[PDB]
Symmetry: D2
């Protein structure tokens, strides 16, 4: 059955690079893309930035389905087509299927799940084809809803706590005054403090060298009335982003009703908010 | 009445640059272009070169008319669309009109007549969007058929002659041996020799300074049995290309049945052949 | 006296665009630039990203001064040269002058002061020539030290206060729970709360329409124990960035020893930190 | 001994692509290139075209040697440098060596010999970095003088002949009137006619199928008083360019004093002239 592959990925996820190599290897396959249509009807150049308009979007949408119809109603030579957009809008994604059935075509999805940190990394160098962070963020947030990834939301029963980070947040990567005050203000308030850190626990030869150093400084110098502490396991090289988000679902979320996140590294503040935890960023953390 | 503007011009003639500025100033106008569609269905990048295929052309054509229909069947907001191709194919150009009438739309043409010399000038710097000389040549040859420009073809009654050029052809810009021999070989053969030159005749103060110098060298040193001589009028700054093509229709074509053209400057050899005169190029003449 | 113009501006501030147009109009002027040299010795392409190395920087530096010497020791035709870098390093900037005097040349500065908001705007679209935010930030922070712009640092005598923002911070652009709690936690703690907002005060016909609405919501619904409130004057169209930074130096800084800034709009959080006030960003604010 | 590699190749021959990959693999190696320097001192953009000027060339030259000195006088870490230009000027090439010895450095050459047909192929798509055919031609002509390739010039004793081509020249790829006349005009004149062709002689099963067809048409229909005929051997897939230039040095040049070449395919007309044989091109032959 002639197929309609939808690529599912955020801007600069590989979608297009894939559809070109693929079509270049699989005869009978043709591409359909919104950005292309968007740029074409405006006669724009590479350095020109298109301006969103319902009227134009309507036209573009119009152009896709029609082209789908046209090409897919070709010979037996035509094996199918690729709708190389972000396709992160469920409302529309559904629309393509219900369109596909009423014509005898099947629908496939080719997913391009690239890590946020890597999506930013790429989108910033994307130049004129780059996209604003809120859209990139908004997009990724849909890529997660698609994948069915978890989003937190309190935990009835467990105490109301506030997770804190050390490097840069609690400490000035000596004590970072205002923030350390906060940890205690929240201490009075009736909150559980759960300090956390992405500093590797230690070295292969001594797997807690740094964890102990941290815990000591946190308690003895800063004097943070922590209730629990968690750190990056020794010999773990995954992203801070990935790392803490695991520590959450595995230790804190279950024994705690989280209300806040005090941190400083963007990728981490990005992760916190993204999953459902409010996060206040106390300093610039672009690294 | 909603309009369908067709741009008539050769590659790199201004077409697109026009349609962008225009649409950018005239609301209700949208663009339709083949190259765009061609690149899109292949998912190509700027550095990739598409490969002509009837099957794809058919698809592209399909995409244009359908998009025309779609957009033009919009509100009263839609004033019309631009078909920004070369549109130098009469067969198709007709097709758009006969399509336009059977839907209640008019058709307009925006012509971009740029000089050949300038088209090459641009196309060579066009980079990856550049096009092979024979297509550029073939294209321009259609742009002329469109404009209704003249193409020569003998002249019954008048003698059979061969036009010769001086700078570079007859002379080594001292005598250029083989070529000068030819002028006489054709002299025996029973041909009229009509020497011609784009060397300005002279200076404002002496409007034949060079014409005389030339004629003298041509007769006295080279010894070319010329029957007639023509040169660029003093104070004329138009192109060699333009220049000689006027001298032809005004002096030679009427009193002669031309069979050959011996020359050396590409733009001129290009012009000769282009209008209907066979031309042998005796040396590299890229200047 | 032959001159050595140094361009003073952050990445994507106009520097290069200026030096090209200038040299294009002023004969006897030649360009010297680090990025160029950096890319050249590595044989890099546009899509390649150079890697910082002292050894290479040393070489590049070496290349500039030598080229300066070489060209400036030309004829009377050579009027001078442009050192089109960021030149925001005082250590080096000094070096060029002390170099200039020991050879009989003067030094000029052409400054390109572009607003941060506009620098980000451009750098994000800069593509492969774009630069990381911390460097852009770090750079701008030097452009300010150059211009001699003010950086705050407490105010002895005046009470310790915390400035708060409304739209997005205190309010969910109904009340934003955690943040409003904070305003009171700091209220107990012994801090003065100085709410602030970039919401235009009102309309030409009623220049406080919104200021009153705000103040009411802030006091009556949120219940923030504010001590003072400031807002964007009616009919003011300058940037939020520019706006609040004026309200600070003119109303708060003088009557207050500021310790914190709770806000949400990046350009504003960027401004706060930049001038010397710690700022915690409570939510994504990329708009 | 620290080395100075000079790349020897025509525009778009691989030079730069090589020097980047190389430096990327061999630590201690740095690049020096004229075009870079040329563009930098003018502050030019990619779409801007530099304008040749002795004064600027002098400056650029100045910049290279100085940079050579500078970098090569680095530590033991510096293994050498690449002068990635065309380096087809012997006058200068010598200069680099005599410069190298007076400082204790050796000189190496990395040659990039790419076929003319392929150089044009590339240079036309080179876009703004492309170069005019006469320079490309002039360049290749130096690349040949470097390689020590042969250039013809008469052959005392042997008769004065004129080589003719069939496809497109003698025949209209039926007879091509004017050109066939010429073959006989030269026949009277006292010249030997040596017809030649790049049409494969035949098929594996019958290695002269086409050679016979040709010879028959040439003699029986056209009536060319040929004295000798040569064709592309069966099962030969090298370029027409390469092909005929071998047939020349192996059959004609030795038994003939060539005065002219009548042909039509550019790559071949290009080859003829290039080696020392005058060639008149009778028609457009861009294929
Ligand atoms: C950049 O952006 C373009 C698209 O890149 P890619 O990330 O692979 O696809 P997509 O953005 O559609 O997911 C390429 O030309 C690349 O060089
Ligand atoms: C080159 O080629 C593109 C099209 O140029 P132009 O000659 O104006 O239009 P067209 O080739 O359609 O006639 C532009 O981006 C320009 O910079
Ligand atoms: C982008 O970046 C390049 C340099 O831009 P510009 O901001 O004007 O100069 P600079 O970054 O040196 O201050 C240009 O080619 C422009 O199109
Ligand atoms: C084009 O021209 C540039 C130089 O190409 P190349 O032919 O490999 O080197 P060179 O022209 O120096 O011999 C590249 O960026 C390529 O994409
Ligand atoms: Ca941190
Ligand atoms: Ca001439
Ligand atoms: Ca706000
Ligand atoms: Ca031929």
């Amino acid at each position: 059955m002639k197929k309609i592959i939808l690529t599912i990925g955020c801007p600069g996820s590989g979608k297009s690079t894939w559809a070109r190599e693929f079509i270049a290897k699989n005869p009978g396959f043709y591409n359909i893309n919104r950005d292309d249509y968007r740029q074409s009807i405006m006669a724009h150049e590479e350095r020109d930035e298109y301006k969103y308009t319902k009227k134009k979007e309507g036209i573009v949408t119009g152009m896709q389905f029609d082209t789908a119809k046209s090409i897919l109603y070709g010979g037996d030579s035509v094996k199918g087509v690729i709708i190389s957009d972000t396709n992160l809008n469920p409302e529309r994604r559904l629309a393509w299927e219900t369109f596909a059935k009423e014509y005898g075509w099947k629908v496939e999805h080719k997913v391009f799940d690239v890590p946020w940190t890597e999506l930013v990394k790429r989108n910033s160098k994307r130049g004129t084809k780059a996209v604003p962070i809120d859209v990139l963020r908004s997009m990724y947030k849909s890529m997660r809803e698609y994948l069915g990834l978890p989003v937190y939301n309190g935990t009835p029963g467990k105490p109301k706590a506030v997770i804190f980070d050390v490097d840069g947040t609690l400490a000035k990567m000596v004590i970072n005054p205002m923030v350390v005050e906060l940890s205690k203000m929240y201490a009075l308030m009736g909150y559980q403090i759960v300090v956390v850190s992405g500093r590797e626990s230690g070295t292969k030869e001594d797997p807690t060298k740094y964890y102990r150093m941290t815990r000591k400084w946190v308690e003895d110098i800063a004097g943070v009335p922590l209730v629990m502490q968690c750190q990056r396991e020794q010999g773990d090289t995954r992203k801070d982003d990935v790392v803490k988000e695991e520590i959450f679902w595995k230790h804190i979320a279950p024994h705690f009703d989280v209300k806040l996140a005090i941190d400083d590294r963007t990728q981490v503040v990005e992760m916190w908010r993204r999953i459902g935890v409010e996060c206040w960023q106390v300093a610039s953390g672009d690294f």
